[PDB]
Design a protein around this motif. Structure first.
Motif, PDB file in Angstrom:
ATOM      1  N   UNK A  67       0.833   6.936  33.267  1.00  0.00           N
ATOM      2  CA  UNK A  67       0.534   5.918  34.358  1.00  0.00           C
ATOM      3  C   UNK A  67      -0.836   5.969  34.845  1.00  0.00           C
ATOM      4  N   UNK A  68      -1.064   5.031  35.826  1.00  0.00           N
ATOM      5  CA  UNK A  68      -2.461   4.819  36.205  1.00  0.00           C
ATOM      6  C   UNK A  68      -3.226   6.090  36.816  1.00  0.00           C
ATOM      7  N   UNK A  69      -4.387   6.241  36.889  1.00  0.00           N
ATOM      8  CA  UNK A  69      -5.206   7.190  37.415  1.00  0.00           C
ATOM      9  C   UNK A  69      -4.942   8.622  37.102  1.00  0.00           C
ATOM     10  N   UNK A  70      -4.724   8.853  35.774  1.00  0.00           N
ATOM     11  CA  UNK A  70      -4.392  10.196  35.024  1.00  0.00           C
ATOM     12  C   UNK A  70      -5.611  10.300  34.327  1.00  0.00           C
TER      13      UNK A  70
ATOM     14  N   UNK B 235      -1.265   3.366  44.503  1.00  0.00           N
ATOM     15  CA  UNK B 235      -0.044   2.762  43.747  1.00  0.00           C
ATOM     16  C   UNK B 235       1.002   2.508  44.889  1.00  0.00           C
TER      17      UNK B 235
ATOM     18  N   UNK C 198       3.032  10.396  35.352  1.00  0.00           N
ATOM     19  CA  UNK C 198       3.193   9.575  36.467  1.00  0.00           C
ATOM     20  C   UNK C 198       1.541   9.599  37.032  1.00  0.00           C
ATOM     21  N   UNK C 199       1.504   8.966  38.304  1.00  0.00           N
ATOM     22  CA  UNK C 199       0.203   8.493  38.666  1.00  0.00           C
ATOM     23  C   UNK C 199      -0.792   9.830  39.337  1.00  0.00           C
ATOM     24  N   UNK C 200      -2.186   9.769  38.518  1.00  0.00           N
ATOM     25  CA  UNK C 200      -2.899  10.910  38.918  1.00  0.00           C
ATOM     26  C   UNK C 200      -2.788  12.021  38.399  1.00  0.00           C
ATOM     27  N   UNK C 201      -2.206  12.160  37.426  1.00  0.00           N
ATOM     28  CA  UNK C 201      -1.802  13.416  36.649  1.00  0.00           C
ATOM     29  C   UNK C 201      -2.987  14.036  35.882  1.00  0.00           C
TER      30      UNK C 201
ATOM     31  N   UNK D 176      -8.927  16.860  43.347  1.00  0.00           N
ATOM     32  CA  UNK D 176      -8.311  16.325  44.612  1.00  0.00           C
ATOM     33  C   UNK D 176      -8.399  17.151  45.985  1.00  0.00           C
TER      34      UNK D 176
ATOM     35  N   UNK E 286       0.724   6.928  47.209  1.00  0.00           N
ATOM     36  CA  UNK E 286       1.954   6.584  46.430  1.00  0.00           C
ATOM     37  C   UNK E 286       3.048   6.231  47.394  1.00  0.00           C
TER      38      UNK E 286
ATOM     39  N   UNK F 108       5.917  15.990  42.135  1.00  0.00           N
ATOM     40  CA  UNK F 108       4.638  15.655  42.676  1.00  0.00           C
ATOM     41  C   UNK F 108       3.832  16.762  43.009  1.00  0.00           C
TER      42      UNK F 108
ATOM     43  N   UNK G 216       9.033  15.199  32.335  1.00  0.00           N
ATOM     44  CA  UNK G 216       8.940  14.595  33.452  1.00  0.00           C
ATOM     45  C   UNK G 216       7.945  15.110  34.430  1.00  0.00           C
TER      46      UNK G 216
ATOM     47  N   UNK H 157      -5.038  24.707  46.732  1.00  0.00           N
ATOM     48  CA  UNK H 157      -4.062  24.278  47.757  1.00  0.00           C
ATOM     49  C   UNK H 157      -4.340  25.009  49.017  1.00  0.00           C
TER      50      UNK H 157
ATOM     51  N   UNK I 153     -12.246   8.769  39.624  1.00  0.00           N
ATOM     52  CA  UNK I 153     -11.177   8.503  40.883  1.00  0.00           C
ATOM     53  C   UNK I 153     -11.633   9.218  42.007  1.00  0.00           C
TER      54      UNK I 153
ATOM     55  N   UNK J 141      10.041   7.677  40.102  1.00  0.00           N
ATOM     56  CA  UNK J 141      10.474   8.660  38.804  1.00  0.00           C
ATOM     57  C   UNK J 141      11.973   9.384  38.829  1.00  0.00           C
TER      58      UNK J 141
ATOM     59  N   UNK K  66       5.426  14.401  37.437  1.00  0.00           N
ATOM     60  CA  UNK K  66       5.125  13.441  38.527  1.00  0.00           C
ATOM     61  C   UNK K  66       3.881  13.534  38.953  1.00  0.00           C
ATOM     62  N   UNK K  67       3.688  12.638  40.100  1.00  0.00           N
ATOM     63  CA  UNK K  67       2.202  12.313  40.531  1.00  0.00           C
ATOM     64  C   UNK K  67       1.370  13.340  40.865  1.00  0.00           C
ATOM     65  N   UNK K  68       0.243  13.336  40.677  1.00  0.00           N
ATOM     66  CA  UNK K  68      -0.806  14.382  40.990  1.00  0.00           C
ATOM     67  C   UNK K  68      -0.470  15.730  40.593  1.00  0.00           C
TER      68      UNK K  68
ATOM     69  N   UNK L 149      -3.158  -0.651  42.450  1.00  0.00           N
ATOM     70  CA  UNK L 149      -1.986  -1.197  41.604  1.00  0.00           C
ATOM     71  C   UNK L 149      -1.111  -1.570  42.471  1.00  0.00           C
TER      72      UNK L 149
ATOM     73  N   UNK M 240      -7.401   3.490  44.298  1.00  0.00           N
ATOM     74  CA  UNK M 240      -6.535   4.439  43.873  1.00  0.00           C
ATOM     75  C   UNK M 240      -5.107   4.497  44.323  1.00  0.00           C
TER      76      UNK M 240
END
Ligand SMILES: CC(=O)N[C@H]1[C@@H](OP(=O)(O)OP(=O)(O)OC[C@H]2O[C@@H](n3ccc(=O)[nH]c3=O)[C@H](O)[C@@H]2O)O[C@H](CO)[C@@H](O)[C@@H]1O
Ligand SMILES: CC(=O)N[C@H]1[C@@H](OP(=O)(O)OP(=O)(O)OC[C@H]2O[C@@H](n3ccc(=O)[nH]c3=O)[C@H](O)[C@@H]2O)O[C@H](CO)[C@@H](O)[C@@H]1O
Lengths: 256, 258, 257
Positions: free
Chosen positions: C58-61, A61, C88-91, B116, A91, C132, C111, B152, B61, A67, C113-115, A43, A59
């Motif tokens: 968002x994408x990839x979630x 972005x 957001x992305x990848x969550x 991940x 990202x 994130x 909110x 992690x 993914x 945000x 955020x990504x991942x 994207x 994958x």
């Protein structure tokens, strides 16, 4: 070249030999320069400029809105240079009007899987961001810096040229050029001598950089004392001036 | 039970065995072999040369069989081998080997690799391992059987993770972790033996005590490694578990997490 | 359409009439999506799951996936998400397990955020921010207005108190009381989230009572039991001190010091 399963917005502008893989979205106001390969499942959102001979992997972005709650939908930008590799799941966010309205990346950078480049960050050339490195926002990364996996950089920090961070470092203040940092919180250890050798630095410039580290970190001088003491070596050595300049630019403190 | 979604792209040289499923918008690249009963979800990228065994599950993914990104490791062919009954969750990256080391990344059987997570080039994973969310094996990491790496957990290049060992969440591991040892922190430090794990897997009361003792001999009696090893000879002959502990220490040229 | 023709929408899915779904997204069986919600491209939604109104994903979630928890055995556990959330992305958000709640729950105005990862049986309240790569391992309860900064790690069964703040890279293995700021790996209590309190309009009086309460718990050598007893009075006068006191009282893993 352009997979028929890709979506290309009519106001996107692609150079002649750009490749786009299947199920990728090149959104509005996205410009992609000559020889760049966009992988599958990518994207891209604008306004964004991507230069020549880049590679962007699945994958990712690239060009999304931050945000961050201080962004209110302004038409901020993302600019990426030439010959960059952007790996899986990266990202990259566009800027905010409260700074420069622009996230900027230079040339020959390697941004590994799941790295994050926050709004208003500025990356130079020849940098490597290892997996899951996160630049929170307004972060400046100078040429040849290496940040190892899961390095976390706080907003407004500067990473100096040829600096190096160990795996899992959490960086909350500026890192001077050439300094190697480790830990959470990050601490200075030594100098990136391998990076000096990689760049064919003279043995005399290396020994002078070795002294310069001692001056700032091992002799109990204040920053101002250290600056005056480096003044001479800076004039004699451009290599040392870069070290000296990064410490002078660290208005909010160096990593110790 | 086979179902190959027609929105997926299957290379002519890819090989699919009986009961394989492939979800929509997945890519099974050239020279990828997929064993019997394996389920590939949607939005998966598989790149070869890669062999995946039987009854695996690979979630959306994920990128499985990619090249490592440092072009300082150019070279081919390099490969990926994944065994049987593995679960690979969302967004996992697994890279192939490099010609500079073993030319193969290797994963055995019955492993659980959570979202991940990253398995770096030339790494070797045994059997019944658990890699929790965002565990990152940097490259040339050997994880022996039954090890658990919490969320992690970061493992430095060349490190060995001993059988039945445990890492707490957010561990940064720079030296070898002996079998059965629990480590925590950044940098990672040894705390104890993984008694919770030993209990759950049916270890004898007698073996557990001999390992508790052997921990003390290595870490708590102020011996040298080389002395500590010599002192363990007799327990190691009596208890295969103590032998596994001794061997992990003996083969840590790199040094052990203290 | 508003539903992209390249999406897969299960026949059993229930979508309000103005829901948007981008290309190559999956809305699975028994997923309900409320009015005004926008699903991006490349999103995987599985059920049984209920998502509310005016959310953006968002994408990839992957939202509503089975937990990898090895105790989970294919049961129709649930995920419930409220209104006005951004994901957001990848969550990753996993459904519950029958061994605890059978449900993972998210409120309103959050909110994420990504991942970020929201593990099985977690409960998120309202107005939270997960920066994130924040990871909630499972059975984690995050109360309203909490901010978890990037790469905050939360051990299973921990409770994050209302209005608390974790610094970037915090690894939290114990409960974080309401209003408390924590940092580091392992996470350490530093102070209270005064900046948070001022951004939300707390009165000078409440902030002062909270300042004193922190001292009673963290700075006087009291056991937990004794601090609770000593907070009783101020908790009777200030709702915020009661919230604080309750977060200490309800700790199952002890509190971050
Ligand atoms: C019981 C219930 O309410 N939902 C369960 C169901 O979801 P569900 O059936 O939604 O999940 P699947 O992954 O099986 O299918 C998702 C969607 O993709 C479509 N599809 C699937 C494969 C394919 O090759 N092509 C294709 O088009 C299906 O027709 C469906 O609409 O199974 C999942 C496990 O598999 C579980 O996590 C869910 O809890
Ligand atoms: C792989 C798996 O199924 N994971 C699930 C399992 O984790 P896990 O079995 O680790 O969870 P528990 O909380 O039940 O474990 C108890 C404690 O023992 C520790 N411990 C665990 C294993 C070990 O070999 N050594 C050891 O010391 C854990 O860190 C924890 O602190 O139950 C949790 C609680 O329902 C879930 O959140 C996880 O999704």
């Amino acid at each position: 070249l352009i997979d028929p399963r890709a979506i290309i917005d009519p106001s996107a502008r692609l150079a002649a030999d750009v490749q786009v893989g299947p199920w990728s979205i090149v959104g509005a106001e996205v410009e992609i320069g000559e020889g760049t390969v966009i992988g599958p499942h990518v994207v891209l959102k604008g306004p964004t400029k991507i230069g020549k001979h880049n590679r962007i992997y699945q994958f990712s972005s690239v060009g999304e809105d931050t945000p961050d709650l201080k962004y209110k939908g302004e038409p901020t930008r993302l600019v990426i240079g030439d010959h960059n590799v952007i790996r899986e799941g990266v990202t990259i966010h566009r800027g905010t009007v409260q700074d420069r309205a622009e996230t900027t990346i230079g040339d020959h950078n390697l941004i590994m899987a799941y790295a994050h480049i926050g709004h208003d960050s500025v990356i130079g050339n020849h940098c490597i961001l290892v997996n899951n490195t996160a630049l929170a926002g307004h972060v400046h990364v100078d040429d040849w810096a290496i940040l190892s996996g899961y390095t976390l950089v706080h907003q407004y920090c500067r990473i100096g040229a040829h600096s190096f961070s160990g795996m899992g470092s959490a960086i909350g203040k500026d890192v001077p050029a050439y300094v190697t940092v480790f830990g959470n919180p990050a601490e200075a250890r030594s100098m990136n001598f391998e990076g000096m050798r990689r760049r064919g630095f003279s043995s005399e410039a290396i020994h002078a950089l070795r002294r310069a580290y001692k001056v700032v970190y091992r002799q109990g001088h204040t920053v101002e004392e250290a600056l005056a003491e480096l003044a001479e070596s800076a004039a004699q050595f451009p290599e040392v001036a870069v070290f000296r300049d990064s410490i002078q630019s660290a208005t909010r403190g160096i990593t110790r």
